[PDB]
Design a protein around this nucleic acid. Structure first.
Ligand SMILES: [Mg+2]
Ligand SMILES: [Mg+2]
Lengths: 135, 64, 113, 43, 189, 51
RNA sequence: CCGAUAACGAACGAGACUCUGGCAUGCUAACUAGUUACGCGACCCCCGAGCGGUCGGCGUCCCCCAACUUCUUAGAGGGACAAGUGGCGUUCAGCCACCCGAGAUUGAGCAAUAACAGGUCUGUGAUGCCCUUAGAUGUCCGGGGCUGCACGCGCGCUACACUGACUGGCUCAGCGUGUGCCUACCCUACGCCGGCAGGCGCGGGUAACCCGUUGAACCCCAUUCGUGAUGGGGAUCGGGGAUUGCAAUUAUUCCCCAUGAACGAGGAAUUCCCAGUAAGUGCGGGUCAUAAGCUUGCGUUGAUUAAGUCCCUGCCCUUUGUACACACCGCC
């Protein structure tokens, strides 16, 4: 146990990933070498801790976004998210089940008596609401 | 008259018990009848998968 | 002591330090002794870096009522040239150079020289 | 009678001096030359 | 083939109970020329399970202060005791030791903290590693107590302890202690 | 009890008792606990822990 | 730390850090460390072994008369990061196991805001006030005392035995010290005398140059003893002999010959401890003219149990109550 990282390594890992995402990769030794010149880290023992957290975070980044961000990642998600627009809309149903009261509302609005609207049998009982208190 | 001494296999370790952590609750299944599986408590270092003797079948079952 | 200590604090910070800390402990006009502490800025205490980051001094002041102890700790500012500050940077201090942002990934070209 | 047989006092907080006690009371609120300062001295 | 002490083949010894099969370490993989190795068997949990049981015996037989590090002396004691039991019973000393461990390991116990009636409140069944631990402890303590104030040496007392435990004859200290402990668990079921 | 019961399927009875406590006894026996100033205003009973 | 989130961004402490240990047949090197190779020997050899074997025997920076850093030393660089794989987890923080690996938690040092009328005025030319200051509470000198013994307690050492004791042989360390301002006092090799403690000459070493290849103990292998307060134990005491010191009585210490006491594993209780650890076992430093049953370190041999819990004992955080705030050693 006792391998929980510290703010000192986490802040630095986030910052260097944000700054040098293009230069860096998902190889530990490559990351521990690029860090040696992209940051003046006084200690080797902290440098390779930073490199390990960097590899962990970048392995995460390849799959999904995290709290640390990158502008290219934002643009990639924007250009990818506008997808699976169906060939047929989910809101063009051939029939629409409609209530008698809402049908009265439509005829008030003058847009009633549409062919697409199909009135349904109103519910009977008025058995909504839940029983009060426990039991 | 005595029920014969039998053997069982630990399938899972539930967790420590005894208010000193001196025993563990584990789940055991019988090789003599794999469907029959009860909750036993044992003392000593227990890993999952190990088999162990049982002098008597039904003593107590309690949830933590 | 409040005037003198605050003047010393101001002089230290004006001459430029990450922080400083003075303690005056002893008896003034009363039997019961009191210690008064005045701090400002950063001040590290533990580990190796304190040895070459913090300048310490302890003096005795002989008053008619007895003895007054003065303790002074000054966290020196980091100095690359090292004449007025420590040479090494703080071990936990990590600083990252910003990229040039001169990417320019345009159409391929060849430049002869 | 405030001490045991050896001579250590049985009530360490109970101050034995009439001039001063556990807490440091400040003379004249820390005023005068050879004294701790006050708010006016700080500013 | 391994020839523990140059003899006493390991491949003829079987652990007849599956409950102890995977904790006794007399098989060919754990078979070793000598009962001595600085193997870091207490590095972590369950590491002693793969430790050879003859090694465990020679590690538990160095006790009670005056002899805590004398592994060479304990190894020679184990050597002499194994030779004695081989010439006395007529089978493999390793098989004798395995059967002794099986019969010495108390199958149950009892443990609580509350107001005990006779010894301890709640009966419980022990783990196989606890079986091996307590069997080795009981056998070693029985041999040590037997060879305290008599002419009979440690090797001979250990020998008769294993011989009596391997069959069950009510005179072995380990067997008697197991009987008492099983009885108190039975009464405090 | 079920093993020694003569009947084939006996539904063992239940003891129904309505205890009343003074607050001294209730707090001493930990039926009720001291709660924060905000928590005191919650009249919802503690959960049954049924699952 | 992650997450929740009227907070966001930080700082001290923790961590990071320094030292130490573990790995580099990779680098720089070494007559104050050596190793291989080779040459002279010395012996076993002769069956003949013959590029046979042993040599801490002598040599090859005797500087012209080999190389090399593996062993040793000490510098710079590396290397380990939960990095790789599987499983669990909000699939986050991380946790478990396994592979490759020398190492997958080596030990320390440093160490916050503060509090303890905690301890030291017998550490000081640190120090206020009081006391004494010539028949001194200054200072010196002689002797005694700090050890004094119906008794109680604490840290300890040695034992109770055969898992042993004695006798002999074999065989292995690492810390580290070593000749002095004052200051008088060093570590010791070699030879000789004595049985020992010791004594007498002759060096070496201000030190990886000499002690020293620190021939340590435990242990290992052989002898005797034989369950007997006994060849276990060596307490108490008699006599004698040496050493240091100006001085050994109230025995400084050491040696030799004698008596041989309790003690046959220890009530109620109680201490310390998780891997090169406990424990067994010796060796240095400090104290020192003489002094270790102490302490601080080092090495050797080397385990059982556990990878959990709040039962006991405590401590911390939150909620809560407060007439306390010099804060329960309170107030009343
Ligand atoms: Mg630290
Ligand atoms: Mg005598």
């Amino acid at each position: 146990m006792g391998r929980v990282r510290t703010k000192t390594v986490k802040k630095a890992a986030r910052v260097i990933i944000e700054k040098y995402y293009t230069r860096l990769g998902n190889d530990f030794h490559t990351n521990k070498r690029v860090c040696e010149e992209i940051a003046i880290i006084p200690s080797k023992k902290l440098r390779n801790k930073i490199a390990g957290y960097v590899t962990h975070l970048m392995k995460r980044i390849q799959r999904g976004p995290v709290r640390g961000i990158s502008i290219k990642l934002q643009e990639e998600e924007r250009e990818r998210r506008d997808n699976y627009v169906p060939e047929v809309s989910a809101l063009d149903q051939e029939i629409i089940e409609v209530d008698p009261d809402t049908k009265e509302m439509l005829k008030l609005l003058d847009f009633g008596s549409l062919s697409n609207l199909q009135v349904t049998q109103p519910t009977v009982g008025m058995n909504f609401k839940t029983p009060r208190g426990p039991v | 008259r005595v029920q014969p001494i039998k053997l069982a296999r630990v399938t899972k370790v539930l967790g420590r018990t005894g208010s000193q952590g001196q025993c563990t609750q584990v789940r055991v299944e019988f090789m003599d009848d794999t469907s029959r599986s009860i909750i036993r408590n044992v003392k000593g270092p227990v890993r999952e998968g190990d088999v162990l003797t049982l002098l008597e079948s039904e003593r107590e079952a309690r949830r933590l | 002591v409040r005037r003198a200590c605050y003047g010393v604090l101001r002089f230290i910070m004006e001459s430029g330090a990450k922080g400083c800390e003075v303690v005056v402990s002893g008896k003034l006009r009363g039997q019961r002794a009191k210690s008064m502490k005045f701090v400002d800025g950063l001040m590290i205490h533990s580990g190796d870096p304190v040895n070459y980051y913090v300048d310490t001094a302890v003096r005795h002041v002989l008053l008619r009522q007895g003895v007054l102890g003065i303790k002074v700790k000054i966290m020196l500012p980091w100095d690359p040239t090292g004449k007025i500050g420590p040479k090494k940077p703080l071990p936990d201090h990590v600083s990252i150079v910003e990229p040039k942002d001169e990417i320019l990934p345009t159409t391929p070209i060849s430049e002869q020289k | 009678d405030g001490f045991d047989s050896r001579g250590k006092r049985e009530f360490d907080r109970h101050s034995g001096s009439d001039r001063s006690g556990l807490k440091h009371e400040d003379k004249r609120g820390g005023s005068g030359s050879h004294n701790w300062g006050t708010v006016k001295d700080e500013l | 083939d391994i020839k523990l002490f140059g003899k006493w083949s390991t491949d003829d010894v079987q652990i007849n109970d599956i409950s102890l099969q995977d904790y006794i370490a007399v098989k060919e993989k754990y078979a070793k020329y000598l009962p001595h190795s600085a193997g870091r068997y207490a590095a972590k949990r369950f590491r002693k399970a793969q430790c050879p049981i003859v090694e465990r015996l020679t590690n538990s037989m160095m006790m009670h202060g005056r002899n805590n590090g004398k592994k060479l002396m304990t190894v020679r004691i184990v050597k002499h005791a194994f030779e004695i039991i081989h010439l006395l019973t007529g089978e493999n000393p390793l098989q004798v030791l395995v059967n002794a461990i099986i019969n010495s390991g108390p199958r149950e116990d009892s443990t609580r903290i509350g107001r005990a009636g006779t010894v301890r409140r709640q009966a419980v069944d022990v783990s196989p590693l606890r079986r091996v631990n307590q069997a080795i402890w009981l056998l070693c303590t029985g041999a040590r107590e037997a060879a305290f104030r008599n002419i009979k040496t440690i090797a001979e007392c250990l020998a008769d302890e294993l011989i009596n435990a391997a069959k069950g004859s009510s005179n072995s200290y380990a067997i008697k202690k197991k009987d008492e402990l099983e009885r108190v668990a039975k009464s405090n079921r | 009890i079920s093993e020694a019961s003569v009947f084939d399927a006996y539904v063992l009875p239940k003891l129904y008792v309505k205890l009343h406590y003074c607050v001294s006894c209730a707090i001493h026996s930990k039926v009720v606990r001291n709660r924060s100033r905000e928590a005191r205003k919650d009249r919802t009973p503690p959960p049954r822990f049924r699952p």
